[PDB]
Structures are given as structure tokens and as C-alpha cells.
Amino acid sequence: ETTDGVYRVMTRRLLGSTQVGVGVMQEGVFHTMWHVTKGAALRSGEGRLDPYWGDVKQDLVSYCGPWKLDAAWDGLSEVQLLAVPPGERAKNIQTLPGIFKTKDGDIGAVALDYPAGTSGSPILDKCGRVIGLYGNGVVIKNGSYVSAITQGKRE
Amino acid sequence: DMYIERAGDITWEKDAEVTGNSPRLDVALDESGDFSLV
Numbered sequence A: 001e002t003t004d005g006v007y008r009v010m011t012r013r014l015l016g017s018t019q020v021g022v023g024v025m026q027e028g029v030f031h032t033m034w035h036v037t038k039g040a041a042l043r044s045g046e047g048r049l050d051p052y053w054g055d056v057k058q059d060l061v062s063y064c065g066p067w068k069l070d071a072a073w074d075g076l077s078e079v080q081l082l083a084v085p086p087g088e089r090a091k092n093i094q095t096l097p098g099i100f101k102t103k104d105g106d107i108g109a110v111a112l113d114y115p116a117g118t119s120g121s122p123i124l125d126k127c128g129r130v131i132g133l134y135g136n137g138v139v140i141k142n143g144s145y146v147s148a149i150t151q152g153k154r155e
Numbered sequence B: 001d002m003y004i005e006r007a008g009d010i011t012w013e014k015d016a017e018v019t020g021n022s023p024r025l026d027v028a029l030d031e032s033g034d035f036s037l038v
């Protein structure tokens, strides 16, 4: 299945069918976070998806072709996390992002607490464009999880 | 082996649950792609 849309990343190695993460299929390319698949090949029905690009530091990976997501957060507007939690239906959560101030520049941050198996869920702008993926971040004082808005580069 | 199942369309839904904060955090990214608070 090469259909555009959000997908669940599942495994049968652990007990029963465990959801390890989430991903985005766009323009025949599957996008997810490196820590979800570890760069391993994926199965899509009878078909198979092989990795094409990846980077452990950016914590990203693309399958069947190059990274296709090029939209970016404008720094002002509210965004929407399209969260796909294990065993649960896909749900849109609207929020105004925070900031991850780093030594190499700033990046948006979404402060939504979700289980680890939700890593790879897309973050969308008002046009419905994927501005990044949720699932690589940090845990703060009150135990709340804050993810970065991880976006790759498009050639 | 890992596999994929479709979860839905990528669209902005009007009148969705509006929740969450906007924190401004000082963070560091190591060589293993891990973030940590500064």
C-alpha cells in the first residue's frame, strides 16, 4: 500500500502485536523516526519497503525514496498533532508550540504527553501540510513530555 | 519483522481538542540524536 496518509508501525517480535511507532506516506515515500525502526526494512501487505535515507542525529528515516516533507512551522500559528496512540484511533490535537532553544538555533516544541509507541505522529499546519514529526524530545520537572518538531531537508 | 497499517488521512480537523502548553526550554542535542535539558 503506497496510499498517502498516516500509518502505524507494528512489530510481532515482542508479546502479541506491539505498536513501536507511527509514520507518514507521501509521494510514494514512507517517513518515520530512526529510533522507531532502527533503519530496518518494513512490510506493507505482500509488498516490502527498504530504507533510502536516514540520520541518527536528526532521528529520521525515509523509505522507497528521498525525504519529501518540506513545510515548516511559521513560529506563530497553532499547529495540530495527529496522534496515533497504540490500540487507539487517530486523533487531532490542536496546540500552540513552544521552543527548544539550542546552540545551533531554535526549533518548535509540542508539549503533549503520549505513550512512546506514538513517536512518528505528524504535526500539521493550517493547510494540512506536515511541518514535522513528534517523538524525539525531553521530560521536564513536572514529568511532562515535550517533543521537538522534527523536520528533514528536501532536495 | 516490522509492518505497517493505515491509521488515517492527513488533514486539519476544525473543532478539535485544543490543549497543551508552549514552554521555552534550553536543550542540547548529542551525537546519538538525544536531547537533554541545559
Ligand SMILES: O=C(NCC1CCOCC1)[C@H](Nc1ccc2c(c1)CNC2)c1cc(Cl)cc2[nH]ncc12
Residues within 6 Å of the ligand: A035, A059, A114, A115, A116, A117, A118, A119, A120, A134, A135, A136, A137, A138, A139, A145, B032, B033, B034, B035, B036
Ligand atoms: O523522545 C523520546 N525521549 C526519550 C529519551 C530518548 C533518549 O534520551 C533522551 C530522551 C522518546 N523516544 C525516543 C527513544 C529513543 C531515542 C530517541 C527518541 C532518539 N534517540 C534514541 C519518547 C517518545 C514519545 Cl512520543 C514518548 C515518550 N515517553 N517516554 C519516552 C518517549
